[PDB]
Amino acid sequence: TQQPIVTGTSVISMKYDNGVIIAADNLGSYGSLLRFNGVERLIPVGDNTVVGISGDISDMQHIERLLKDLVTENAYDNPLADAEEALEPSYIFEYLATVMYQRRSKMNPLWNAIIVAGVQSNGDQFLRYVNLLGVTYSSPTLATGFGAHMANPLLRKVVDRESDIPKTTVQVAEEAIVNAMRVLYYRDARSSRNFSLAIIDKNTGLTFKKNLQVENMKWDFAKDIKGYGTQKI
Amino acid sequence: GTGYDLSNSVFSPDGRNFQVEYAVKAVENGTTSIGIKCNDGVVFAVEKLITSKLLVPQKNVKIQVVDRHIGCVYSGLIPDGRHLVNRGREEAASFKKLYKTPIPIPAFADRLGQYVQAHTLYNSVRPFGVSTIFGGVDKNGAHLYMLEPSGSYWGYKGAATGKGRQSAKAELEKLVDHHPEGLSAREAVKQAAKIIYLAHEDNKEKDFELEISWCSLSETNGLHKFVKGDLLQEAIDFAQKEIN
């Protein structure tokens, strides 16, 4: 049993017709201190999988080492390591889910919320979540922490059910994701303006965008607001 | 008296460990394999005797990778070889976990060295029946090594072991003399394919299959990779051509 120290906030994601999109800002909080700003919380595994992590950063780094090892180990005595026998997003997830549940079962959890996004070898999209309790679930859209409360409602307006997937394009999806990130920047006190976004498309492959920034924010209406009730000036 | 050769860690009257020496016999009785250090990497090649047409070609791979920057090939009892590589892998993983940086070739060599030497310390274990050629690129260059069943190892410019080690060594020595400036990864791959072909005369009875791998700072980015397709055939031909 422990307590998170340096933490990463929301991780949001959704799937579109040709793949999945996942994003997460670059902040590493220390309580209410916005302590670190160059933290990458999206971990690419191979070229068909990206793992988004929130929660304790020290544990995130541990999961990173684990993922690198998975790649190294899968390459051993594997002549088809970059072909038929490369790591599938589902393998990477089942692995992490296993670890997450074993650790909570030993009363020593990896204090994180994880979302594994990718495209299977047969082209199928992959989006599944696992957290410190070992709980897992899939949905056309998935978000952790604050994003679960504010991103999902927005992302679900694009893909409310399975049949909305084929009707959604990368442009629509990426736009929804970028807007959600802005909303989270407005209301989440542990969020950052800088973030990374990655797309895993069954045709274009893995696109990993770094250093994005929330833009087009509305703040002007603030000038009109004064006092907290009766004040006029 | 006698019987000094029935138990592993026993010193004979002349200070030898006969069981290690018998382990060597098992190595000399094995397929030939080599390693060539080039100007920015290393190349590994090995002879693969075609027992019969039934062996699916290209499937029974012998060269093994350790971590992501090291290659290992060996001659002798194959299972003993795998055993040693598994140890090397655990050994490399441990080093990376504590020091973050992937294990340096010299450091790695000693890990295998100590482990192998350990198997000559007790009569409850048997020495390793393989000589291993391995190496890769690291923070400061390329390194080639060869480890004997005694646990003895040194850095090499070129190395060979197995049935045709003499032919190979002869060839390697020529290369060393005619290239004081240094061979290139591209060249080494071909030269390696040739030596395996030449050294195959000491077993010319059975047909074989060529296998090459390399690790070059420029050609593979410092990662160990197998030579396949076009680059492979191009090397096979270069040999078939100079075999006549």
From Swiss-Prot, chain A:
Description of how the protein assembles with itself and partners: The 26S proteasome consists of a 20S proteasome core and two 19S regulatory subunits. The 20S proteasome core is composed of 28 subunits that are arranged in four stacked rings, resulting in a barrel-shaped structure. The two end rings are each formed by seven alpha subunits, and the two central rings are each formed by seven beta subunits. The catalytic chamber with the active sites is on the inside of the barrel. Interacts with CIC1.
PROSITE patterns per the UniProt record, alphabetical: PROTEASOME_BETA_1, PROTEASOME_BETA_2
Source organism of this protein record: Saccharomyces cerevisiae (strain ATCC 204508 / S288c) (Baker's yeast)
Subcellular location(s) of the protein: Cytoplasm; Nucleus
Family statement: Belongs to the peptidase T1B family.
Protein name: Proteasome subunit beta type-7
SUPFAM superfamilies: N-terminal nucleophile aminohydrolases (Ntn hydrolases)
CC annotations in GO: cytosol; nucleus; proteasome complex; proteasome core complex, beta-subunit complex; proteasome storage granule
Primary role: Non-catalytic component of the proteasome which degrades poly-ubiquitinated proteins in the cytoplasm and in the nucleus. It is essential for the regulated turnover of proteins and for the removal of misfolded proteins. The proteasome is a multicatalytic proteinase complex that is characterized by its ability to cleave peptides with Arg, Phe, Tyr, Leu, and Glu adjacent to the leaving group at neutral or slightly basic pH. It has an ATP-dependent proteolytic activity. PRE3 and PRE4 are necessary for the peptidyl-glutamyl-peptide-hydrolyzing activity.
Keyword tags: Cytoplasm, Nucleus, Proteasome
Any GO BP annotation: proteasomal ubiquitin-independent protein catabolic process
Chief localisation class: cytoplasm
From Swiss-Prot, chain B:
Example of a GO biological process term: proteasomal ubiquitin-independent protein catabolic process
Cellular component aspect of the GO annotation: nucleus; proteasome complex; proteasome core complex, alpha-subunit complex; proteasome storage granule
Localization of this protein: Cytoplasm; Nucleus
Keywords for the protein's UniProt record, in alphabetical order: Acetylation, Cytoplasm, Nucleus, Proteasome
Chief subcellular location: cytoplasm
Posttranslational modification: The alpha and beta forms are probably products of the same gene with different post-translational modifications.
Gene Ontology terms, MF aspect: mRNA binding
Function: The proteasome degrades poly-ubiquitinated proteins in the cytoplasm and in the nucleus. It is essential for the regulated turnover of proteins and for the removal of misfolded proteins. The proteasome is a multicatalytic proteinase complex that is characterized by its ability to cleave peptides with Arg, Phe, Tyr, Leu, and Glu adjacent to the leaving group at neutral or slightly basic pH. It has an ATP-dependent proteolytic activity.
Quaternary data: The 26S proteasome consists of a 20S proteasome core and two 19S regulatory subunits. The 20S proteasome core is composed of 28 subunits that are arranged in four stacked rings, resulting in a barrel-shaped structure. The two end rings are each formed by seven alpha subunits, and the two central rings are each formed by seven beta subunits. The catalytic chamber with the active sites is on the inside of the barrel.
Family per similarity comment: Belongs to the peptidase T1A family.
Protein name: Probable proteasome subunit alpha type-7
